[PDB]
Design a protein around this ligand. Structure first.
Ligand SMILES: CCCCCCCC(=O)OC[C@H](COP(=O)(O)O[C@H]1[C@H](O)[C@@H](OP(=O)(O)O)[C@H](OP(=O)(O)O)[C@@H](OP(=O)(O)O)[C@H]1O)OC(=O)CCCCCCC
Ligand SMILES: [Zn+2]
Length: 373
């Protein structure tokens, strides 16, 4: 007779709420992919993580959120979640997401995660694809705040990204014409000192230039970032014909595997140790006196073990003059580099980044790159 009573009725209601999290399609946050989302937008019908729920809470005309475990649910609300959910959302709100569009993860800055949510649910850019034209048309112009090479100041400059000319250019007759093949971009809000800060890099003469820009409008800077990825995508299809689209997407733009301060010495190993900001981009290791420098003090190619590159914990017994005690030795065919890290946790992370590069076979295109150093 237990089935006939009000306690059973309630237990079934409670089980129905929790059951929605045990469907495979709802195993990860709809927006950033974090595992085991505990929150739901009951107007959009998605299951999202605590962090994403806060972003949603901030578009209250579109999304209302509450906890699947801790808040009360009306029957109709549970039935709404059950008829929607994360797979449904993917088919609706991610119906027409361009292959080049950057999909954020929990590690990404607030700007990326917020604008992903706004593009999907607020602006509905992937439901109504004409809204994608600002960054999908192969031409984009606009003004951005650009840091001076050496002067610390941000000034308004017109940028033009033109796939037809194969370049990003800007004017201060352009001041610079930067070929797409040599461009990368990564959001760096903490380094730049602005939440919408984007770092754009350009390789010429085997020397990387850092350009540091922002826009007051978060949508506009993220649209520049994705426009640059679109341009990169079209360039790569041309340089690598018969590479699949999926093959190309990881190459469109590259976040840095690691950055941070280390001390280094010179080619003799006796010169004295100097603090530098290091950035590891794929196989290119760049070191700067300051992170916002336009140019590196030096750049090192980290090739594969098949070409005689290796990485070791520690320093040789000879070594003197350093004061951070956690050493890393990089052996290249031409030079032994000695870097010192302030902590063991950082040493471990640096060795792991260098080891990943050494352990991976070189790609065809990387042989000519190596040749330039
Ligand atoms: O000034 P110092 O007299 O103490 O020593 C220089 C310093 O260590 C440089 O590091 P950096 O400033 O470029 O980080 C190094 O260049 P490198 O970058 O090759 O290690 C240069 O060697 P070199 O210019 O290679 O001969 C050294 O002479
Ligand atoms: Zn999330």
């Amino acid at each position: 007779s237990g089935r006939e009573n009000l306690y059973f009725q309630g237990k079934e209601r409670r089980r129905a709420v929790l059951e929605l999290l045990q469907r495979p399609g709802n195993a990860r946050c709809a927006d950033c992919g974090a595992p085991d989302p505990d929150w739901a937008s009951y107007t959009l019908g998605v299951f999202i993580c605590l962090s994403c729920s806060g972003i949603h809470r901030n578009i209250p005309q579109v999304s209302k959120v509450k906890s699947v475990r801790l808040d009360a649910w009306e029957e109709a609300q549970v039935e709404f979640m059950a008829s929607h959910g994360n797979d449904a959302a993917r088919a609706r709100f991610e119906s027409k997401v361009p292959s080049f569009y950057y999909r954020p993860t929990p590690s990404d800055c607030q700007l990326l995660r917020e604008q992903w949510i706004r593009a999907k649910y607020e602006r509905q850019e992937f439901i109504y694809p004409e809204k994608q034209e600002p960054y999908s048309a192969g031409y984009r112009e606009g003004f951005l705040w650009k840091r001076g090479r050496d002067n610390g100041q941000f000034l308004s400059r017109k940028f033009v990204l033109t796939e037809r000319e194969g370049a990003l250019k800007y004017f201060n007759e352009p001041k610079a014409v930067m070929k797409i093949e040599h461009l990368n971009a990564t959001f760096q809000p903490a380094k730049i000192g602005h939440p919408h800060g984007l770092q754009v890099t350009y390789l010429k003469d085997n020397s990387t230039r850092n350009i540091f820009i922002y826009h007051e409008d978060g949508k506009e800077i993220v649209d520049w970032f994705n426009a640059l990825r679109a341009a990169r995508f079209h360039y790569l299809q041309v340089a690598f014909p018969g590479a699949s689209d999926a093959d190309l997407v990881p190459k469109l733009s590259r976040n840095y595997l690691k950055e941070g301060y280390m001390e280094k010495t010179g080619p003799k190993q006796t010169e004295g140790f100097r603090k530098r900001w290091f950035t590891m981009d794929d196989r290119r290791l760049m070191y700067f006196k300051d992170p916002l420098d336009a140019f590196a003090r030096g750049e090192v190619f980290i090739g594969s073990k098949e070409s005689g590159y290796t990485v070791l914990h520690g320093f040789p017994p000879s070594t003197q003059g350093h004061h951070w005690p956690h050493g890393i030795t990089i052996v290249t065919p031409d030079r032994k580099f000695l870097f010192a890290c302030e902590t063991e946790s950082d040493q471990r992370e640096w060795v792991a980044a260098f080891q990943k590069a050494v352990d991976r076979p070189m790609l065809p295109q990387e042989y000519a790159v190596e040749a330039h150093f």
